[PDB]
């Protein structure tokens, strides 16, 4: 892709903005981040303040402050239609919102305890969720109906994150007992399990190349899996104090970002570190790539949404 920002140019990025007014000053912190895939200048954040916010990077305006969650917001997903956004929370709900009406259109109650992960299906019509209640669920966006809800009797433990593979046939759920469980959506079956981590899985990310999966856990490692071989071919081991809270590949699969203790970006081809930011004070809760990796975005417990670019 001619437009993609290459490593030499990416390596020169610096903080270009830091916005602290998206969420409440008295209940400080942003806990979740997503960018709209059809326009990455539209930003979605979940707050410690229980609110979901849509913000325009270009105009630097809050387009909507979406209220209704009764606990902090820990997952957010931006639909490509631009007018739908999704959130989830320790209040055990998944909420579907209209941006233009600044309203909640559905409250999906698939779970009995905190919802730990949220992922939009390839079709754009369904949401996958994971929970501490040990189940995953697949829910219809338009009716809020829970279409299926499944757990592993054998594993029987809290699911800590969930992501669809980009083709929309399989997905992964991380567990509290350090497993990455791969599921076949159609058959509702657990088709493989990737062990090797220690401690709770914290984040998983599927690459757009369709064959890489990156996983992180409390063992302060990021493990890379080739789904064709079902093997862990590379592990990035950080220090044992480091918390990896968020993983994401850029849209091209060229780069992998991690965030938590701080923000780091690796080149997938050579697994070389290409950017490292330590601007946030305290935990970084989200990281994302703008279109063509033309900017990076991050969110922090320090209240800020930061953009990094030339």
User: Shortest distance, CB of residue 237 to Na ion, whole angstroms?
Assistant: 10
Residues in the chain followed by a break, C to N above 2.5 angstroms: none
**178 near Na ion, rule: CB under 5 A:** no
The CA distance from 86 to 92, in Å, is 14
Query: Of 255-284, which residues contact Na ion (CB under 5 A)?
Result: 278
The residue range among 70-78, 154-162, 170-178, 238-246 that interacts with Na ion, by the rule CB under 5 A, is 238-246
The residue range among 57-65, 232-240, 255-263, 297-305 that interacts with Na ion, by the rule CB under 5 A, is 232-240
Instruction: Give the nearer residue to Na ion in terms of CB position, either 143 or 278.
Output: 278
The CA distance from 193 to 173, in Å, is 10
- Give phi and psi for 37, each to the nearest 5: -60, -25
User: Shortest distance, CB of residue 19 to Na ion, whole angstroms?
Assistant: 17
Instruction: Give the nearer residue to Na ion in terms of CB position, either 163 or 220.
Output: 220
Instruction: Give the nearer residue to Na ion in terms of CB position, either 156 or 195.
Output: 195
Out of 61, 123, 240, 270, the only residue in the binding site for Na ion (CB under 5 A) is: 240
The residue range among 78-86, 109-117, 220-228, 254-262 that interacts with Na ion, by the rule CB under 5 A, is 220-228
Tokens of 189: 């079956």
The burial class, CB within 10 Å (0-12 / 13-18 / 19+), for 17 is middle
The burial class, CB within 10 Å (0-12 / 13-18 / 19+), for 142 is exposed
The CA distance from 240 to 203, in Å, is 16
The residue range among 178-186, 201-209, 233-241, 269-277 that interacts with Na ion, by the rule CB under 5 A, is 233-241
Report DSSP state, residue 198: -
Residue nearest to Na ion (CB): 220
Count CA within 13 A, CB hemisphere, residue 232: 15
Instruction: Give the nearer residue to Na ion in terms of CB position, either 148 or 198.
Output: 198
Instruction: Give the nearer residue to Na ion in terms of CB position, either 251 or 298.
Output: 298
Count CA within 13 A, CB hemisphere, residue 14: 3
**203 near Na ion, rule: CB under 5 A:** no
240-253 CB burial, b ≥16 within 10 A, e <16: eebbbbbbbbbbbb
Size of the residue set binding Na ion (CB under 5 A): 3
Instruction: Give the nearer residue to Na ion in terms of CB position, either 220 or 299.
Output: 220
Instruction: Give the nearer residue to Na ion in terms of CB position, either 133 or 219.
Output: 219
User: Shortest distance, CB of residue 222 to Na ion, whole angstroms?
Assistant: 12
The CA distance from 73 to 89, in Å, is 5
**298 near Na ion, rule: CB under 5 A:** no
| 163 DSSP β-pair partners | 172
**220 near Na ion, rule: CB under 5 A:** yes
Summarize as ranges the residues that interact with Na ion (CB under 5 A).
220, 240, 278
């Amino acid at each position: 892709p001619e437009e993609l920002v290459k490593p030499e140019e990416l390596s020169k990025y610096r903080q270009v903005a830091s916005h602290v007014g998206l969420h409440s000053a008295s209940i400080p912190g942003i806990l979740a981040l997503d960018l709209c895939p059809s326009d990455t200048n539209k930003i979605l954040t979940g707050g410690a303040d229980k609110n979901v916010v849509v913000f325009d990077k270009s105009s630097e305006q809050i387009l909507a402050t979406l209220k209704g969650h009764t606990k902090k917001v820990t997952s957010v997903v931006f639909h490509p239609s631009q007018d739908l956004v999704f959130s989830a929370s320790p209040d055990a709900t998944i909420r579907i919102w209209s941006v233009p009406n600044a309203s909640c259109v559905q409250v999906v109650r698939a779970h009995e305890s905190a919802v730990t992960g949220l992922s939009l299906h390839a079709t754009g019509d369904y949401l996958l969720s994971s929970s501490d209640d040990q189940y995953w669920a697949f829910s219809d966006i338009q009716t809020g109906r829970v279409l299926t809800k499944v757990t592993d009797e054998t594993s029987g433990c809290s699911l800590t994150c969930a992501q669809f593979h980009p083709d929309g046939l399989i997905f992964g759920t991380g567990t509290m007992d350090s497993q990455i469980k791969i599921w076949d959506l159609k058959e509702r079956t657990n088709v493989a399990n990737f062990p090797g981590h220690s401690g709770p899985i914290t984040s998983i990310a599927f690459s757009e190349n369709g064959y890489y999966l990156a996983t992180a856990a409390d063992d302060s490692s990021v493990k890379l899996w080739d789904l064709r071989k079902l093997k862990n071919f590379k592990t990035l081991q950080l220090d044992n104090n480091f918390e990896v809270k968020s993983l994401i590949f850029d849209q091209s699969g060229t780069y992998l970002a991690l965030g938590g203790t701080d923000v780091q970006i690796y080149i997938c081809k050579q697994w070389t570190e290409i950017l490292h930011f330590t601007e946030h004070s305290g935990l970084t809760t989200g990281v994302a790539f703008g279109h063509h990796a033309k900017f990076i975005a991050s969110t922090g417990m320090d209240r800020s949404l930061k953009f990094y670019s030339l």
